[PDB]
């Protein structure tokens, strides 16, 4: 029943997204589209006709005008012409950034541009909410900048064959119908037969500044490296592209340092070559500062925060790569062969060999879990590999059981390879549990007694006193267990370090450790031969030997031995002896080769290593918390102060299988004839033909760029802690809340993703939380309380700077963007004069300090007239006044009482002597031209505008401006109601451009300062007049650099 | 029985006069979890959501 319901499921949007695919993002990220080439004109401003020229006419014969001879003109030949922004209206690009900003001529409505952001509540299609004008303008400027990120392309030239120029070189545009461009690029090339405006302007210009200006021809017979040309353009886009190219050039590298980096990162196992001769200036933008890498690393950490499903596939990928590169493979039969030789009697009820072989079951697939355990060493910051619960004995076990003895053996060998700091305590408590009743020790309290599950001891606070202080364990009452504790303290592996990477190209994303440094939980000792042979001088070999000796002492104890038959004792000790001297090559591999492989692999990871120091037994330095922050508290501004109380803990444990790791430790063999320097040279060679790392570097650059853009943009509509300029305060804006900021940030993120062609997700972790106080930091804390924090000092950002530059320019050229500044005055003006309403005569306007005015505020209230008395309204001073004179309203005051005010004031405004000034700040505007010789009344337009005002939306202000003429005309009355407050008519370009002069109506010659290079013989060619006046004819640098793939220039030696 | 309608009606009136909107997707996005801890059942993030 035309109630306009069921129009609400419209534009109201959706933001909630299910994001289980963090793994896909982490394993591979889309590369930004950095380099793009533009072959067209580096301009974004278009001159358009508005009113066709008065041709033919009864005054001048048609033979005078230039158009009658079909001569192309650099400028429109029209009665009225104006300037309109139209990004890339002449460009010819290869990749589209799909962020165009286009308006229509002011005679055509342009309201839809300013209602694009937050007018989801606006009903009318012709209206928009003034309070989001600032946000809409900021979005428009951001898209304006983004659409212009292109590199100018060098096309080609041709010498002139006509006397119009002194043999200049003219650049040829690509694409079809290139004829029209030659008349637009070079205004000075036109002939000057007439006295008209265009001909006069051209004749008053310099003649040698046209076409090609300078070039750098390096190689005879190849493309010129770059050129400089005089051609139509705008200073703003030229500056933007210049700084963009400057950033790209700062990011450049050359092949020689590339081969140096690749040689370094491969540890000398791979040799690559680069050419040595005059090149052609390729462009390979891959070098970025360490700060950007740290920012990207922190963002990446915050994604995988406290989630295991996101990190586990990374570990499997690393395991697969390691298995692909490593020379170590499982010996199928070593354990069975060595255990089949022990001697035993067939009359025994038990057989140690049976039990051990039953527990081992070497399924050959155990090296996968061994490899993931190895990979865990690189990410102890977020992932803490631990032994699964199921590996421990079910009820706690007992030393009298053979099965429990073998379980203890498996756990004892498996534990030292995990990244869990609390591992040694669990190793000790594993035996302590089995030894209960048999042999006792003092524990801390009644909860964590000697009979707790060994896996329960997980934090430094639970470390038993007796374990840290050996003397508490009685050498008489507990010999075996004291011996075990001494073994743990004296023979646990010592962590070490190793250098890796190529910092001068790849940078370094290390946070809590020095660059190039990679920590290990095992001491590394480089091998000095390339033909390895079996050796027993290893940490892990000593560990296994000590464990076997401890078991042997346990069996032979006189308090425990008499429970066993002598034959069983002999078999057991023989089995332990066999296990002691097994010929497993894995400890050698871990001590000598594995660190080299990790160092080789690490720089090529998609997720660079993130480590915290390994502490052997210093309970004071065990890390207990790793946190990141993305916000700041209420009043705290300095990140070093709010970091402690605004961080979110990050980390997650991962479970492994002790059986598998023990099998790996026991059954490793090398290929029958191994020569390491050949094996690795053969294996590593393919894997350094991968260019994913450089792509990751570019992605990292864009991440920080976007973060800085977000903070700078948000610092405009709200209040933040960072210093920032402010040029758009005069544009009205609402009192922003958290929700408004979140919506604005979502829009910014969408725009940036679209512009650079990113299909994955960007900035999302920052969207959660309030974006008005963003800050990036990270810290971790030891057990003793000493804390360490890292605050990456934010680098620059070209896009934010360019956006601010365009905003600063907008503070002067707001007319060109279809925006009028100031206020409006509503009042009847009837006369035959021809002044433009956009440039009203000074006497018609008034302001707050004009004598005899009335200012009105929040207390609008009206007393109706009675018995002929005039109605009255209350001034802000408490005076009662009639409906006449000059008033001043804040606009919201009219918005909140539209209907009442219309009904009360329209008659007096139309016919009486009432004039009102509405305070707007800024507003879109519309033009309606009219014939001066005909009667014209503008009351209908103003009436519609007034009546369509809504407490949420207003429509574009309509103006009625006369049409300029180039010959004598009659006059006719005109009734005007709306005039602007100050000058707002900077958009106009020329009037009667094809005629000798303008007789009636507003007059305007070609803006001379827009062509300062041509008009001023003394100006240097490279002068610009920003931010006050944008020029329309500049010196443009066009490049011809190559962007070859990495493998095309650097080829390895097989 | 006398009290019940009064409180119910005032609750409804407050519910559809206030600008506040209750949106649990805030909680869901902040936790940003489906089911962590692939193998071991204990996962506090899933537990609190449940």
Verbal overview:
The structure is cut from a larger assembly and holds 2 copies of chain A. Chain A is α+β, with helices and mostly antiparallel strands and 1054 residues long. Chain A has 32 helices and 34 strands. In chain A, the strands form 12 sheets. In chain A, strands 21, 22, 26, 27, 28, 30 and 31 form a 7-stranded mixed β-sheet that branches. In chain A, strands 16-15-19-20 form a 4-stranded antiparallel β-sheet, with helices on one face. In chain A, strands 2-3-32 form a 3-stranded antiparallel β-sheet, with no helix packed on it. In chain A, helix 7 (290-303) crosses helix 24 (692-717), helix 12 packs antiparallel against helix 13 (423-434) and helix 12 (402-414) packs antiparallel against helix 17 (539-556). The two termini of chain A are 80 Å apart. Chains A and B meet through loops of A and helix 2 of B.
